[PDB]
């Protein structure tokens, strides 16, 4: 179902809050983003690792030069944080991702994994920043 | 679900401070920072 898949769908307005929050390779790795290819076609790519680009680009007010290790089944490449869509997972793109995963040999992540993964985001949001994260954030 | 937003001194950037937080700006580092105007009804008599 592309509806349950949208709960772990990472929109564009949520990355801006966590451009400098650590544990980043532990909350976002396992969710799905709506990245752009381009003309209005989209593919569901997999947040695999946390990479950094040597291109610093501004996203509205904020700027971030990092990358995202995304992959659509087998086609994997680098990605920046501006081409992601706030659009939810549609039906044609959900089935397209399903066919890219059935076509690649990757197992579809079980729904219980998505249910245990979607709560990591809400706990990371209400997280009290009592430790030394403000300091590294300003740096 | 309102996080008590402050305005920095030297930055002029809105920060979100909830309780039990250090008062510091999310950037540049500033210990002084001010509060935003109210949302209530301000009505004056031009008098």
């Amino acid at each position: 179902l592309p509806e349950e898949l949208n709960r772990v769908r990472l929109s564009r307005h949520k990355l801006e809050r966590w451009c400098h929050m650590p544990f980043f390779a532990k909350t976002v790795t396992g969710c799905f983003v709506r990245i752009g290819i381009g003309k209005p076609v989209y593919r569901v790519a997999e947040i695999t690792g946390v990479v950094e680009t040597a291109k610093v680009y501004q996203l509205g007010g904020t700027r971030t030069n990092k990358g995202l290790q995304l992959r659509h089944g087998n086609d994997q490449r680098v990605f920046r944080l501006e081409f992601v869509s706030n659009q939810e997972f549609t039906e044609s793109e959900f089935m397209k991702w399903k066919e890219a995963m059935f076509s690649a040999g990757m197992q579809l992540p079980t729904l219980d994994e998505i249910n245990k993964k979607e709560l990591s985001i809400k706990e990371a949001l209400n997280y009290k920043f009592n430790d030394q994260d403000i300091e590294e954030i300003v740096k | 679900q309102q996080p008590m937003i402050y305005i920095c001194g030297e930055c002029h950037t809105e920060n979100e401070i909830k309780s039990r937080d250090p008062i510091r700006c999310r950037e540049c580092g500033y210990r002084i920072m001010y509060k935003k105007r109210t949302k209530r009804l301000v009505v004056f008599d031009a008098r």
Binding site: S11, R12, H13, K14, I35, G36, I37, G38, K39, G60, F79, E82, F83, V84, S85, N86, Q87, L125 | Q1, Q2, P3
Partner: peptide, 17 residues
């Protein structure tokens, strides 16, 4: 105040660059 998109802010494409 979680995702106030209301669509969006003209999402830039990857094959546009």
């Amino acid at each position: 105040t979680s995702t106030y998109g209301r669509y969006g802010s003209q999402t830039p494409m990857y094959g546009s660059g």
